[PDB]
Structure 1
Amino acid sequence: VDQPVHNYMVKRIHKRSLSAAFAIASEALSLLSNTYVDGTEIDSSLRIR
């Protein structure tokens, strides 16, 4: 004679990641570090670029 069964299960999460890079040039940092000092009509175009 049989009796009904109960099954008990358990699972565990798995951790992953994503990574994306982002470069910048040396002249880009040099043009982006002004701190309200420059502003001639030739450096502004390079900063905008």
Structure 2
Amino acid sequence: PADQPVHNYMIKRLDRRSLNAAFSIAVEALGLISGENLDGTHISSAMRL
């Protein structure tokens, strides 16, 4: 007698992890970037760059 085409069934689980990294920024160089008070020359200074 013949044979039948067998097959199997597999169930797998998703194992969860997570990575993280961080940096900072100095309070002295905070307002130097976003601060829109600098009118005419500090907007193209060297320390801003």
TM-score tier by shorter-chain length is: 0.5 to 0.7
The structure richer in helix per residue is 1
Partner SS, residue 46 of structure 1: coil
User: What's the C-alpha RMSD, in Å, of the aligned pairs?
Assistant: 2.4
Structure with the bigger RCO (C-alpha within 8 Å, sep 6+) is 1
Question: How much does 1:33 deviate?
Answer: 2.4
- Equivalent residue pairs, number: 41
Q: For residues 14 and 24 of structure 2, what CA distance do their matches in structure 1 show?
A: 33
- Where structure 2 has 5 or more consecutive residues not aligned to the other structure, the ranges are 1-6
Return the TM-score normalized by structure 1.
Answer: 0.55
The residue number in structure 2 matching 1:20 is 21
- Where structure 1 has 5 or more consecutive residues not aligned to the other structure, the ranges are 1-5
Going from structure 1 to structure 2, the CA distance change for 1:7 and 1:28 (only over 3 Å counts) comes to same
Return the TM-score normalized by structure 2.
Answer: 0.55
Instruction: Report % sequence identity.
Output: 56
